[PDB]
């Protein structure tokens, strides 16, 4: 009740008055992920909180055998662009991160010239088409017409049938977003509605936008410099074990942060004027690393992030249900990603022959993942603009590889990916590029350096869930406690996105400080009739309403009577404008 | 083809690169109205044109007997807020005009406590309700469903019948926007679609927002100071008589500006790199002024603005058809407005008794016009926050009065308003406030000072028109010539608004300089299903779909079958959210 949603330039460009009594308030942010950093930025810029009163608590201190790549953006990351228009670029003078990003993606717009391959390097013949049947389209629409409240614990396989899963649409969708068939239909529905304005860019990634470098260099480092320039305090080697919260009949008040500061057990006592921002849960927690000759050791370890959320959930069911997300994760789930770095011309030339661009040119390369449709692992890989690390040699590329299925033997390396060294993952990948099999072993072992990473929780955002499993950003009656990040709850936005991190941060800061400025709503595209007309046209692989209805009597007649009632009206002009007539 | 429309924060917050070759370009803006000033501001900020190369050409030089008041804003003036977030306030340090305006309208939000009066000072009993019948509602919707291309030269009386014109809706609508029954149905349609998101605020003005002072002090003066601080050149006593334009088979190029600079006939020769921004036509041209004892003398004079547009239209029909707007204006049209200033407690107390607020308190007073429904003149009046001039005595108010009908005897002063002195207009107004008739003459003649103004073209924006009567902002193949202001043509936006002035200015500058940043589209509210649901609910005076259909078989049955097919779905939840179920 302490915020309101808005849209349009009035609320975008307006500045909030300094919030009431902020001069006597402090902030503690648990973890240094994007959501914590964003919340600190809003605390500085819009809360006008004093930097020395803002404390970022990081578990790690202030050696992997190679480069490791970790996601993209779209124009309607409304909250994220509100943030980064205020963060100075570290690459361009007198320019924001938004400016640098905006100009770069106009100079070198992202698109894919090859989205799906099969048969050891051949482009899928129907690449670019959705190959959705009428039944599959109806299931998509029926899911969207289902209330979110009726999708508690429903799996994607509960709402779609064979036609949909055989479609190219599902190939594009599951791989670009990392949906597994057992994942949350509720989240899949949110994604369908959230990105409906970009349906025309699904097959070719033409709606995706990327930073110049990896996320740490292009997003985190600029935020850090901004926060440091305003005196914000960074606390390393601090493990938050619990937060004692009073949950009374009238209020929720965080009372004390129980920490281990460099082996020493200490405690931070809080008043109502000391705000606590918890990033509950983590998809990168407990990650392990291999090298070119060693697999990343599988693990089920619960780290500090999941232990902390469990300790908060013990104090109120309003603080969420972490076990839905970190327990009972199927062993087929995506766990392993790998970064394969090479300067070898044979590999780089093979990539060029598939993606149609020079990987070393410094512009778009694959334009997003290429999916190997017939790979047992259901592997995809991408090469961003190179190099993605500013100190990497200019003759090197780093390729990011991931597998949706973790418990199935590969086609060339006949083992599950979880049993594979870096070079074995690279060999399986090189096989599917069409590299001659008598060269694969040496090119992977001696011409490349591949670092695998095992992430027990990388699919955790998407686990089947029920309303209530995620805490509200500001739980009911909370006075000084907020939850931020991709396991907190807010309307219609989609998790596994950087936008969701910034949105929850902004909503938390605005609500706890009662900031008198609107939060931009999730973009209104699923309510926009023009966008919905485009979606019907795109989903039906570019067929007008007559062609859609051509083989059915019940519809071909309803359409005849509809066209007779709209003839010569604005509705007919709109349908013609959007190619439905 | 030299611009694109956008929405959302990405394009709002992004800055355009410096446009190509702007260092060798100059700009001439004809007139110093809002559109010219806005275009100069965009030339500085986004064109990065040198201030000394920007020339504002004003006909007047660098004595009325009293104060003269001249409109409001809404949140979705998308282009105007893009502009004024960059203009420094002259009232608050380190703040924009947008900030000052945003904070003021949150501190003192606008609303009316009395919108319509009758019978010499009594509130209309049904004030607040639209009193629209089903037939009237159907005509509203049928107009919106008509293509704009089918409304050439159609009058409002061609598309509405008796029920609509007897509605409270039409009272609110015609007076707040100054529509006459013979005005353009095309523009009325644009207004219905343009402001559909504010239908719930039509009766009480709760969607209106106002500057602190009159428009000159709160909008023009800040822009002027901004332009002067950047070296922009202001040219006074310059009358533009013509612009010689080459209209070839391949290009339109302005060649020379023919001027009279202080009685001297001179000429400004232009290259392709010299841009010309013409504000074609004017609603204030040829205005005459009276005083407390003298009517403003009626006139049909064509001034420099209308002569110039006629001289441009002689060179291409693509430059518009001014005669549609400045000729054959019916003599019943609104011509006269008056500003009545008083410090008299009897008058001020009578106003307080009607509007329910202290006129001298410095906050909202009437919250917008009060309409005298049974006045022969169809008179309305408003009192903004006082005082509206920063050097006015603190015990004074200034009331703005206007009459939609100019050729009908008044109820107390039995003469058309065009024959009335300032004090006679005030007397007619005081009669309709319920002032005792034995006091009206002395309170108007000796306790008030009323300045009338006769404006032959004040209704000119709304004259019946056809596609093509207004020039495109940048006509086809124009290299260096643009048209801006409320007689230029752009999609869906509404004239008689300051937003239209800023929009045309922005579109002209962006197109002529090929600026690489989106222009915000007219707000998408008529395509937003949520907004349309609200509109149905509001237009039907807050009745759900069952009550709307209760007295009809064809609809009450179609609704039964519709409800049976949407039961338990998201569509039903949406309808319930918006009170239609
Ligand atoms: K905002
Ligand atoms: K924009």
Author numbering:
A (entry chain B), B (entry chain B): -1 to 60, 71 to 78, 81 to 591
Reproduce, without paraphrasing, sentences from the article in which this PDB structure was first reported.
We conclude that OhyA accelerates acid-catalyzed alkene hydration by positioning the fatty acid double bond to attack the active site hydronium ion, followed by the addition of water to the transient carbocation intermediate.
Glu82 on the catalytic Loop coordinates the substrate water from below the PEG400 substrate analog in the absence of FAD and also forms hydrogen bonds with three additional nearby water molecules in the active site. When FAD binds, the catalytic Loop conformation is altered by its direct interaction with FAD, and the Glu82 sidechain is repositioned to form hydrogen bonds with the substrate water.
